Each structure stands twice: as C-alpha cells, then as structure tokens.
Symmetry: C2
Subunit: 319 residues, 2 copies
Amino acid sequence: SGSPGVEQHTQAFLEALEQGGGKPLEQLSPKDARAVLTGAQASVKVDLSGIEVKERTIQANGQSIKLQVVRPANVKGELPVFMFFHGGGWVLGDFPTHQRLIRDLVVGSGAVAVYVDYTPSPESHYPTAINQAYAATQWVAEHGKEIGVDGKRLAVAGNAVGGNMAAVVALKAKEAGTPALRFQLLLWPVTDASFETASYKQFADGHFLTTGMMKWFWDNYTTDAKAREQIYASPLRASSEQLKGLPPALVQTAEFDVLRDEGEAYARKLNAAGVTVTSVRYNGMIHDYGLLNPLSQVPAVKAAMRQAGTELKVHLQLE
Amino acid sequence: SGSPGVEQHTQAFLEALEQGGGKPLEQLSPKDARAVLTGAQASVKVDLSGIEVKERTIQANGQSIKLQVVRPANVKGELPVFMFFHGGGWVLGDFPTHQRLIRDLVVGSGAVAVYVDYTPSPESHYPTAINQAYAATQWVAEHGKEIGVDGKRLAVAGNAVGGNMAAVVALKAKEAGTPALRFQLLLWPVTDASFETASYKQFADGHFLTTGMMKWFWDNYTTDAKAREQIYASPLRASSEQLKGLPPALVQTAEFDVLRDEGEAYARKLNAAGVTVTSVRYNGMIHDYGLLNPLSQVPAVKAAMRQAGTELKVHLQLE
Ligand SMILES: CC(=O)O[C@H](C(=O)O)c1ccccc1Cl
Ligand SMILES: CC(=O)O[C@H](C(=O)O)c1ccccc1Cl
C-alpha cells in the first residue's frame, strides 16, 4: 500500500484496497474483472451535471459502431469535438465507468466528446479496436454535422490504453492523410509492450495498477509478438520520421505509475520529431487518478482535470 | 409563481422560473421542448452512485425496442425487477433526464429497473408507446434471466404519463392474462383525457406543469377522441369490473398538481374494485417533485422517494 510521496487521499485509498484484499484482478474472468471497475466507480457520489448525452450508431469499418456523444448542456451550434477512447487494459471499461472523467473534460473544454464503444478483449484482439477507433474518428470528421459538431475541429483523447488508442489513431490519421486532427490528449498512456522501464520495476505492486495486470492486459489484447512490435500497438517504437507531423500533444503522467516512463519517453520521441508537446508529471498520483471516482475530488486531480479541459479548449478554437 | 402552502424550496424554484421567463413550453417545437427538460436536469449536481446501467435491445411488438437495465451495484444473483416508464407528456423525456429518479428507486428498493425507450409523440401516436411498453414487460417476464432478473417478481412504475403507462400496462397484462405483476407504482399519474377537475382549475398556471402543457401533450399523443375514451388512454374511465384483480398500487400525488384529482380518483376507483391501494398526497409539492433534479434534495422529496423505493422492495420479495 503506497510509497512515500503518495498524495494523502490517494494513499488512504491504497491502504483501503489492501485492507480486505481480494484476488489479483488478473486471476478473474473478464466478466468478473469488468464488475470490479463497475462496482468501484459506482461506490461514490460524483458530479455529472452540465452535460447531455445521446447515443448514435454508425456504419464504418464495414461495421456497426456505437457512439456516446457527450455535449455541454444548453449550447446551440456546431461545437468543436474530441474523440474519447476509454482505458481498462482493453479488457475493462465502457462509457458509464468513464463517464465522470468524460464529463469533466467536456464541461472544462466546452467541446463535445464522442465516446467510441470499441470491442473489448479478449472478445476481439488487436487491431480490431483501433480500426474501429480510427473509423469512428474519420466518420465524425466527415459527418459531424449529423451530431451537431464541427468535424474540422477535431481532437483525440483518452486514458491508459485509451491514451494508447488516441496516440495510434493520430498515427493512423497521419498515415492515411486524413482526417485533420487539432490535438491529441494522452492521459497516462500505454505506449510500449515492454515491461522493463524503471517505473515498471519501481511500482510493480501496491499502486493499484500492477505489472501483473499490465501483462495480462496485453496478453488479452494480443499474444502475437510481431503485432506488439508494430507502431500501431507500441507507438514508442516509432521513428522520428514516422512521428513527424503529428498533432500537438498534452501528455499527463502519474509519478507512481508503471506506465510513467514509457509515457514520458513517447513525449520525448514526439519532441525529437519536431511535434509540439507538453509533458507534465503529476507527482503523488497513481495510475488513473483522473478516472477513479473515489479520487475525483482530490485537489491535485481537479487541477489535472482543469488543465486537460483547458488545453482541449485552446486547440479547438475557430481559425 | 406558486400558492400559499408550497414547500419553501419548491416555491423558490417556481419564482426563479417566472424570473427571466421564456415562451410557454407548448409554443416550442418538440425538439426544442425536449432541450428544455434536458437542460434543466443537467443544471444541477445530483447523486447517481450505487447503480450499474447496461443497454439491451429486444425484439418484441414486431419491433426493436431499446432497454436501459439499471441494477444495484455489486449484487450477484437474479434480482426482482420493475419496469420503468418515463414521463414528459409523451413528447418529452428519455433515460438521462429520468436517470436520477430511477437511480433513487433502484438503490432504495434493491430491485432492478428496466427503462423502456418507447417512441415519442408526435413521431408516433397512441397506442404505439403503450404497445411497446406492454411488449417489453412481457419480454422481461419471459426472458429476464438474460438480463439477470427474476421475471416472475415483476412490477411496473412511472411518473406522469409514465404513470399513465404503468397503469395501462397493468390493464393490458390483466386483459391478456399475462404476465403476473406484483405491484404498480404510480407517481403523480395522468389518468384521464379531461381537463375539468378542481385541481386542473386551481393550478392551471404557475406551478410548472400547466393546463396548456397538458392539452398540448395529449394533442401530440392523439387527437382521436375515440382513442382518448379508451381505458388504455384514459384509465379513469374503466369500470369496477375492468379494474378488478389489478395488482397492488402505491399512488403518490402532489398537492399543487393539475393531475392531482384524477390521480386520487383513479386510486378511489381501484379501491372500489377491491384492488389493494395506498393513496398518498404529498402536500407542498408540485408535479414531478420526484423527477426535477433541482428539487432532488428537498426533504419532502427525499421522504417520498424513500417511500417509493421501500414499497417496491416490500412487493418484490421471495414467496
Ligand atoms: C495555436 C494554438 O494552438 O495555441 C497553442 C498554445 O497557446 O499553447 C499553441 C499550439 C501549438 C503551437 C504553439 C501554440 Cl502557442
Ligand atoms: C403481502 C405483501 O405484499 O405485503 C404488503 C404490505 O405489507 O403492505 C401487502 C400487500 C397487499 C396486501 C396486504 C399486504 Cl400486508
């Protein structure tokens, strides 16, 4: 349960987890694992005011894809938009678990969020989810008026594997020459299918997200080692040339996160490629500080969320 | 803005509405009218904790029908269930606007809610919505295991026209001989397409729900006068014999509601037919006190909601 330097409320949260333990998450069935995140997010009162949510199914990727469009309440007009990709190791997560996080970004930015309901793992494996995610991003750019947004002012955002997804959709958009993205918001992202960074070693345990979880997560995503080496799986492996021309990025990392180092390394690589990057480490924080509803009123977390919303606003303004 | 006897917070709410007025709701387009309720429900922080929500589409009424299944968080097993039908004059309403109300009943009862996404008016007219509502009720009884409920322990619930819907689904279930319903929860229900009760005269104006709204609501539902005279439209017109054998009812009405009298009259008719009825008038309250999120922390409203949840629990227990 925690290290020295962990923010006090976070550290109380970690101690409570260890008290009355439970099996490691990765010993559970996907169904049961999913129930854990659902339960935890439901366990606490949180503010969801100021938004309006409507479902929309689209036809893209030769497929039906469900969207949750989340819009600032009582605002008329074609608003700018950001795609939102949820985290959860590809096994876990959905819209309701992530709804508070999304609410915060939407109300903070004044922009519309389009949550993409991508297929989980291991129901599907790489690269189904990211193809869905890219397809939906293309759809919003081209048909955004159908959901009251300006598809020409378009960002991608997400936490954890969702941050992986956002980084990869921006790579697929570069690669494909479309659509134009204003911004990429990478919240404590997964960027590499390797497990040997200093932060992976330091925080393997006792900080909610564990090394054991991460490896189980990737295994459910794909066991194909050649898949894992592709930049659309591990974007940290991309070269300068491949990174060149990517949209401006805000990268937030957590001090006590196994993903910390690979997140800050990717920010470094983007920078070396001439991409505009702001890389900020939130000290005292664990993985998913901005996601976990019990931590949603922690002052540091509120400050991170005000930043993430503001920086979205900044990049989504009229030309 | 209000009468003497209106509860203080409610009366403050009414004064704020009149200040910086706006057109009557019934001068708006359905789309715009819908936006008003959506905006108002989003305008305030409310507690949505303790539930888990999942969407499920079914095939019934020769149709695809969307359900939102709302379940007490972290409870394993086949739970009892109540259908939930939202209000909004058939023109307005949906799941998110009603989600807090539903959350309260779910967490209070320990039972699962099945919200039925029936087709609005005037997109559709009577009796499309109630046929959907009945169909979905039959579906849950027969296939409830598919969504983790015991369909044999099944109630209907709703507010306003949703209360109309619940009363009518119980009549359609009687009529059809199926399914078995444990209970009917009628929250300030619409029961008659007439507009001459004392409460309609007394509170025509200045208490949020107006006579002008109610008549516009019914017109959008159906202008067919012979439809309006059917017991599946105006269940107050039903006879003792038709009412005989209906499930136990809790009816809550609001003192300052145009629907008050027809709601308490229907309770009376049920009683005269030998049906078990509890009829309770919440004094100081306007129409939809239990729905409107700005009123959700008013002590009287909390007491009404604790009652509605408890009485659901009472009727949904194992034999
Ligand atoms: C043009 C705008 O997007 O404003 C941003 C900002 O103010 O940080 C920005 C983004 C990329 C490069 C420079 C700057 Cl200044
Ligand atoms: C059997 C049960 O549903 O308990 C109810 C209650 O306690 O009010 C009830 C319902 C109908 C008739 C009598 C009673 Cl007692």
